[PDB]
Swiss-Prot record, chain B:
Belongs to the CENP-C/MIF2 family. Component of the inner kinetochore constitutive centromere-associated network (CCAN) (also known as central kinetochore Sim4 complex in fission yeast), which is composed of at least cnl2, cnp3, cnp20, fta1, fta2, fta3, fta4, fta6, fta7, mal2, mhf1, mhf2, mis6, mis15, mis17, sim4 and wip1. It is found in: Nucleus, Nucleoplasm. It comes from Schizosaccharomyces pombe (strain 972 / ATCC 24843). Component of the kinetochore, a multiprotein complex that assembles on centromeric DNA and attaches chromosomes to spindle microtubules, mediating chromosome segregation and sister chromatid segregation during meiosis and mitosis. Component of the inner kinetochore constitutive centromere-associated network (CCAN), which serves as a structural platform for outer kinetochore assembly. This is Inner kinetochore subunit cnp3.
Length: 145, 137
């Protein structure tokens, strides 16, 4: 029954506070992606764990072309929930529909194109190594790469 | 189309490069063993991702997330999730996170097998500030 499956889930979670291991908070720990409002591609960041991890949803209308972008210090993850896409990672090209996943490792280039006439909807995560970023820099001054 | 996708990638070392599997079709991924799973992408120590399949009536008993953030994307089935003694129901195209320092369990409440794409991530700097990990890194 569709009425018993909430669109957003608020929940009280422990805070992982080193000083107070029993401290707690309310945080949104779940979303039904079809019902998420988005802001030529769509996205909404859903879960944020700054600075190490973030995740969200992207949708691409028919005939959409996402231009090549660098992953820089983040590893990208994409899970394809619906549609058809052709994706380039470092001049190697592949296409993929539902239940396919690909990663863009740090320091690489990627692009995505909608090759179907249904809109494509993706679950994305990006993550970075906070210790490594501190020791080597992010590519900004004075640590230009 | 392709089941495994290999690709030449730069290493973020600085121009060294590798051979690595950067894409999978989850239906063709072989699983391992209650529930079954396969680890797909590893970028030690900060990020991991994989696929889990629970059969009908399967229940993963409560375990702690400790210093890892876990996220789950539901490709098939219907589940009941307990995070910190609060339970909620979710189904296909739902995503949920298990924050650090909490207890969680997952139960299949449907008649289809459940399939999840999972990721777990950790804050390597914060872990170091807290004393987590030995000298063999």
């Amino acid at each position: 029954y569709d009425a018993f499956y909430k669109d957003e889930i608020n929940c009280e979670v422990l805070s992982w506070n080193e000083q107070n291991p029993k401290a707690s908070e309310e945080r949104v720990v779940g979303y039904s992606l079809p019902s998420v409002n988005l802001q030529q591609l769509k996205f909404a960041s859903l879960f944020k764990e700054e600075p190490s991890f973030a995740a969200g949803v992207v949708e691409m209308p028919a005939g959409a072309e996402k231009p090549v972008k660098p992953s820089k210090h983040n590893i990208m993850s994409f899970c394809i929930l619906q549609g058809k896409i052709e994706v380039t990672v470092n001049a190697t090209t592949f296409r993929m529909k539902k239940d396919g996943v690909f990663i863009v490792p740090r320091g690489n280039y990627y692009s995505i194109k909608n090759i179907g006439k249904e809109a494509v909807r993706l679950y994305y995560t990006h993550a970075t190594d906070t210790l490594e970023n501190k020791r080597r820099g992010i590519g900004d001054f004075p640590n230009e790469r």
